[PDB]
């Protein structure tokens, strides 16, 4: 049975997007919050219709379609997709993902009936990635320096944000974050990381080490 999202939460999220913008970490946290339960294409479509303006909504429709197409390519590349089935009769077409298939157009109840939970979570992750792309597009990691007065956790937050919300492949983010911790992060912390008796091979480990041995001031 389909239950709609509260218009009160949607109104609060819309005003959050209106005042803070699309890219603020609080806005992305709120979107992740309202993106907790797997939503039907109807829900996400109406949500983006309400919270986004017309032009960002067009951009988001484009990006969502592209991400869903990548998902369907991965699905035809692996018959063990949680949206797919074992036989060929359960293969998931883009009409079923975008809610355009038969028995789904405009009807959220029938949508919730025929859709799979794997389908729902794939649609939801696709919509979240598309929202991230459009937010990064509507309004550079290698230009980030730790200010003379800035703390280290703020610098790490800013750097990880800019590196993960960029055009790098997923397998190239951790080495870049590490090598940016080592070369940025003004020479006191640079020497603190350099003289590490242990080898730090993860951004979390570097952050923990620096937070332990940092110069309290």
> Which position among 88, 89, 148, 191 is part of the footprint of its own copies (CB under 8 A)?
191
50 vs 85, beta carbon nearer its own copies:
50
Q: 125-160 burial string, b = 16+ CB within 10 Å, else e?
A: ebbbbbbbbbbeeeeebeebebeeeeebeebbebbb
> Which position among 19, 21, 49, 114 is part of the footprint of its own copies (CB under 8 A)?
49
**Binding to its own copies in span 61-80, by CB under 8 A:** 61-63
DSSP helix/strand/coil, 115? coil
> Which position among 20, 23, 57, 91 is part of the footprint of its own copies (CB under 8 A)?
57
Stretch that binds its own copies, among 9-17, 68-76, 87-95 (CB under 8 A): 9-17
For 212, half-sphere exposure in the C-beta direction (CA atoms, 13 angstrom radius) is 8
**Binding to its own copies in span 84-123, by CB under 8 A:** 106-110, 117-118, 121
DSSP helix/strand/coil, 190? helix
Q: Is there binding between residue 21 and its own copies (CB under 8 A)?
A: no
Q: DSSP E strands: which ranges in the chain?
A: none
Neighbour count for residue 61 (Cβ, 10 Å): 17
Dihedrals phi, psi of 77, to nearest 5 degrees = -90, -5
**Binding to its own copies in span 165-184, by CB under 8 A:** 166-169, 171-172, 175-176, 179-180, 182-184
Mask: binding to its own copies, 117-146, rule CB under 8 A, as x and -?
A: xx--x---x-----------xx-x-x----
């Amino acid at each position: 049975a389909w239950t709609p999202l509260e218009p009160k939460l949607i109104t609060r999220l819309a005003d959050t997007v209106r005042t803070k913008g699309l890219r603020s970490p609080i806005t992305m946290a709120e979107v992740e919050a309202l993106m907790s339960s797997p939503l039907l294409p109807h829900d996400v479509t109406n949500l983006m219709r309400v919270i986004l303006g017309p032009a960002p909504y067009a951009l988001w429709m484009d990006a969502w379609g592209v991400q869903l197409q990548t998902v369907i390519a991965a699905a035809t590349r692996d018959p063990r997709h949680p949206a797919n089935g074992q036989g060929r009769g359960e293969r998931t077409n883009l009409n079923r993902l975008k809610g355009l298939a038969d028995g789904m157009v405009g009807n959220p109840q029938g949508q919730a009936a025929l859709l799979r939970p794997g389908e729902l979570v794939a649609i939801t992750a696709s919509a979240l990635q598309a929202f991230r792309e459009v937010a990064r597009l509507a309004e550079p990691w290698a230009d980030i320096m730790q200010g003379p007065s800035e703390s280290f956790v703020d610098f790490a937050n800013r750097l990880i944000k800019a590196v993960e919300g960029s055009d790098l492949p997923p397998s190239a983010r951790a080495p870049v974050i590490i090598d940016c911790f080592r070369q940025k992060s003004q020479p006191d912390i640079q020497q603190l990381i350099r003289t590490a008796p242990s080898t730090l091979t993860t951004p979390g480990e570097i952050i923990k080490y620096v937070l332990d041995r940092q110069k309290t001031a």
